Design a protein around this ligand. Structure first.
Ligand SMILES: [Cu+2]
Length: 155
């Protein structure tokens, strides 16, 4: 397939507005989405959160519960200075090797731009999942191995 390798730029307040567009409901460490079309907004290492992690709806690496047959619009933002993290959805689960074995990637991005001059790289892609469990992971060597992944349950 093709990975999403095209990115836009957002200042911090734009990043924050976008994060607030996530349509999920938080419960504990889970984010549950409902409806025909859902909007997942994920960020790589929001300030104040542990490295390395993804934040979705203000939670760290949460399990995303998505309805089978939904159109999933994912916005991925990299807010972590010094890194070009990716966001890739795969059926291969953890733990991951330093070079993570995650092919085939069912939907996702290439490496993001590193933050520069108050601007953060972000991108939008769409996913049409069938029922199953998937994981969202970064491909930068060692990141997935050190905790940069989360789970998705589609049902
Ligand atoms: Cu990474």
């Amino acid at each position: 397939g093709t990975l999403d390798t095209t990115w836009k730029e957002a200042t911090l307040p734009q990043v924050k507005a976008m994060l607030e567009k996530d349509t999920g409901k938080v419960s504990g460490d889970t984010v549950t989405y409902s409806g025909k079309t859902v909007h997942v907004v994920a960020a790589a290492v929001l300030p104040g959160f542990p490295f390395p992690s993804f934040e979705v709806h203000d939670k760290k690496n949460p399990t995303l519960e998505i309805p089978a047959g939904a159109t999933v619009d994912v916005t991925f933002i990299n807010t972590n200075k010094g890194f070009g993290h990716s966001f890739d959805i795969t059926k291969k689960g953890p733990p991951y090797a330093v070079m993570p074995v995650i092919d085939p990637i069912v939907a996702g991005t290439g490496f993001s731009p590193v933050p520069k001059d108050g601007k953060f790289g972000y991108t939008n892609f769409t996913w049409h999942p069938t029922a199953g469990t998937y994981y969202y992971v970064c491909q930068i060597p060692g990141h997935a191995a050190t905790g940069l992944f989360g789970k998705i349950v589609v049902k």
